[PDB]
Amino acid sequence: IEKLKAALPEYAKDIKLNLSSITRSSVLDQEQLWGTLLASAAATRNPQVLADIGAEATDHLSAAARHAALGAAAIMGMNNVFYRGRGFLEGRYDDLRPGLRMNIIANPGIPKANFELWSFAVSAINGCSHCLVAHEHTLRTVGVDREAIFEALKAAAIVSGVAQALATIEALS
Amino acid sequence: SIEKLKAALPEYAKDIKLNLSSITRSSVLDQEQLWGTLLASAAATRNPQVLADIGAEATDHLSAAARHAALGAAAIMGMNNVFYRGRGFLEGRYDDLRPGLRMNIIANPGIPKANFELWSFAVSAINGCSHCLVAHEHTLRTVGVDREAIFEALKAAAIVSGVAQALATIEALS
Amino acid sequence: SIEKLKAALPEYAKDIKLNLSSITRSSVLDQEQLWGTLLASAAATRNPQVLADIGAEATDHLSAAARHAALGAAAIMGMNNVFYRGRGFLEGRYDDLRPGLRMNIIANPGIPKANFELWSFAVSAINGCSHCLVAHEHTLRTVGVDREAIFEALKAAAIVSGVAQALATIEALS
């Protein structure tokens, strides 16, 4: 995290500070937080951010957790596009079966509660209402507090700000 | 087809791989419908690897005019998806103003409009613009395109998006 | 530099090329407003090449403060657009909670706020966040910015987005 920070431009000071703050979350535990940071990092599609965050994630997440986080980003990459599209068509295509395989959601290799949090986070970044609302409800049914879900949204947003800030200077170097 | 992308996919993305193999073999869309969709979608994900590989094999399924029309659908929707979505978020408060945006390709894509519209639809799903998605779906219906074909294009766009996300991650960690 | 971007555009993206020429010849917005919009938009597309070209020619139309403000607007909206979009999908069920996100640049961008807000509006259109787009537009109207100028900013955002898509495609296919 210390690397990304110094790498951020001066006009992105707000982002730099928010990043230092999110890494100190007290509402989310180690796996939840770093799993959200890793998934989000992947979802920004920024290679630099993913490399930096993923690196320090090795000291906070297990192999299974890591794969699940990246897998969450990948599977939502598909789901977020499909459901959002069907959503825009005002239920006119709900009678049809999506026929999309997504076993990872049922068996992520770790507690589904965490997988759901990471999927919620990626859905905010990609912008799919159907999915974000679906995963939010699921998290609330398993006992996750709104404050915890809210913290995931903040981390996703912050990582998104980081990726944008970095991609900029990187291209203008 | 495109075994390079499938083989490169990570183990934790098995679902994406299986969906890619399946979409490239459905009997809902014909060759031009399907590959035009895959090409346009690949460009829309902004992932170079996915586009480079699908583009390499697209030459065997699409004519030069089809390829250019697919790629052009992505470019033009890149602009339209931003403009019209913005306008929609403003609750028609700016609908009385003339956009003044040139978009001749839509009227003359160089190939059957039914396909250009299908590809524009797919890209609109990837960028996320309700106005455009709804408009193209309607045009597709007016030109007799099978409701399930439109649905298949949405699925294809979604799948290619997962492929792009899945491969983008590995490339950054390679 | 604009000529460089234009020449790079493929033939099937002629509409994009013409819109770019038109928007850059616009008299609606002045140099700072226009180039600030183009620069902030370029950064938001995530396309390095486009940002580099626009940023190169923007130097002759933007002060150091304006340039920093425009890039800063893209960065801050990158965070805000996601946060408020997600919160928005929850239909206010999370509107009671304190964001706790630092966004000092918004209150003190280093230049009069009206232009900074125009650029924030532009980026919000590109990322696609209803909440932020609506908010920034309202603010602009309350500070005396007319619809024609806000509309021009939306158009520029969309065009730059089309350019970035067209260019990303040829870059990956070359």
Q: Are C46 and B46 in contact (CB under 8 A)?
A: yes
Q: Does B39 touch chain C (CB under 8 A)?
A: no
Q: Does A97 touch chain B (CB under 8 A)?
A: no
Q: Are B118 and B150 in contact (CB under 8 A)?
A: yes
Residues of the domain holding C111: 1-174
Nearest by CB: C133 against B44, B80, B86: B86
Q: Are B93 and B122 in contact (CB under 8 A)?
A: no
Alpha-carbon distance B87 to B99, whole Å? 10
Q: What CATH number does residue B84 fall under?
A: 1.20.1290.10
Alpha-carbon distance C3 to C21, whole Å? 9
Alpha-carbon distance C90 to C87, whole Å? 5
Q: Does A127 touch chain C (CB under 8 A)?
A: yes
One-letter amino acid identity for B34?
A: L
Question: Which one, of B31, B168, B42, B174, lies nearest residue B111 by Cα?
Answer: B31
The string over A113-150, giving b where at least 16 C-beta atoms fall within 10 Å of a residue's C-beta and e elsewhere, is bbbbbbbbbbbbbbbbbbbbbbbbebbeeeebeeebbb
Tokens 């996915």, residue located: B50
DSSP state of A87: H
What residues contact A97, with CB distance under 8 A and at least 6 apart? none
Q: What is B51-78 written as a DSSP string?
A: HHHHHHHHTTTS-HHHHHHHHHHHHHHH
Q: Are A17 and A171 in contact (CB under 8 A)?
A: no
Nearest by CB: A161 against C78, C89, C93: C78
How far does the CA of residue C58 sit from the closest CA of chain A (Å)?
12
Alpha-carbon distance A33 to A59, whole Å? 13
B93 exposure class (CB count in 10 Å sphere: 0-12, 13-18, 19+): middle
Q: Does A45 touch chain B (CB under 8 A)?
A: yes
- Put simply, the chain A residues between 3 and 22 with a CB less than 8 A from any chain C CB are 9-15, 17-18, 21
How far does the CA of residue B17 sit from the closest CA of chain C (Å)?
22
Q: Helix A112-126 crosses helix C64-89 at what angle (to 10 degrees)? A: 130
CA distances from B152 to B21, B118, C69, C111 (A): 14, 10, 44, 49
Q: Are A44 and A159 in contact (CB under 8 A)?
A: yes
The number of residues in chain A equals 173
Q: What share of chain B is helix, strand, coil (3-state, %, to 5)?
A: 75, 0, 25
> How many domains does chain A divide into?
1
Q: Do C76 and A161 touch (CB under 8 A)?
A: yes
Q: Are A39 and A70 in contact (CB under 8 A)?
A: yes
Nearest CA in chain B to A98: B155
What residues contact C34, with CB distance under 8 A and at least 6 apart? C23, C24, C26, C28, C61, C152, C156
Question: Which one, of C73, C99, C128, lies nearest residue B126 by Cα?
Answer: C128
Q: Is B112 left (phi over 0), alpha (psi -120 to 50) or beta?
A: beta
Q: Are A38 and A54 in contact (CB under 8 A)?
A: yes
Return the number of other C-beta atoms located less than 10 Å from residue B63's C-beta: 12
Q: Are C76 and A118 in contact (CB under 8 A)?
A: no
Question: Which one, of B94, B120, B96, lies nearest residue B107 by Cα?
Answer: B120
Alpha-carbon distance C84 to A153, whole Å? 9
C172 exposure class (CB count in 10 Å sphere: 0-12, 13-18, 19+): middle
DSSP state of B12: G
Q: Do A154 and C99 touch (CB under 8 A)?
A: yes
Residue numbers of C annotated as active site? 129, 132
The number of residues in chain B equals 174
Question: Which one, of C112, C126, C29, C111, lies nearest residue C77 by Cα?
Answer: C126
- Vertex A39: Cα angle to A35 and A43 (nearest 5): 165
Q: Are B140 and B105 in contact (CB under 8 A)?
A: no
Three-class secondary structure assignment of chain C:
CHHHHHHHCCHHHHHHHHHHHHHCCCCCCCHHHHHHHHHHHHHHHCCHHHHHHHHHHHCCCCCHHHHHHHHHHHHHHHHHHHHHHHHHHCCCCCCCCCCCCCCHHHHCCCCCHHHHHHHHHHHHHHHCCHHHHHHHHHHHHHCCCCHHHHHHHHHHHHHHHHHHHHHHHHHHCC
Q: Does C162 touch chain A (CB under 8 A)?
A: no
Q: Are C116 and C35 in contact (CB under 8 A)?
A: no
One-letter amino acid identity for C120?
A: S
Cα Rg, chain A, nearest whole Å: 16
Which residue among the candidates B39, B123, B132, B160 is catalytic per the annotation?
Answer: B132
Q: Do A100 and B159 touch (CB under 8 A)?
A: yes
Question: Resolution of the coordinates in A?
Answer: 2.0
Q: Is A91 left (phi over 0), alpha (psi -120 to 50) or beta?
A: left
Nearest CA in chain C to B55: C173
What residues contact C60, with CB distance under 8 A and at least 6 apart? none
Furthest C-alpha separation in chain C: 51
Six-digit token string for A60: 């906070």
Question: Which one, of B30, B31, B135, lies nearest residue B77 by Cα?
Answer: B135
Q: What is A5-27 written as a DSSP string?
A: HHHS-GGGHHHHHHHHHHTT-SS
Q: Are C150 and B24 in contact (CB under 8 A)?
A: no
Nearest CA in chain B to C154: B83
Alpha-carbon distance A111 to A117, whole Å? 10
Strands (E), B36-154: none
Q: Does C149 touch chain B (CB under 8 A)?
A: no
Q: Do C161 and B72 touch (CB under 8 A)?
A: no
Six-digit token string for B82: 């931003």
One-letter amino acid identity for A39?
A: A
Nearest by CB: B82 against C13, C15, C126: C126
Q: Are A123 and A135 in contact (CB under 8 A)?
A: yes
C7 exposure class (CB count in 10 Å sphere: 0-12, 13-18, 19+): exposed
Question: Which one, of B170, C85, B171, B130, lies nearest residue A121 by Cα?
Answer: C85
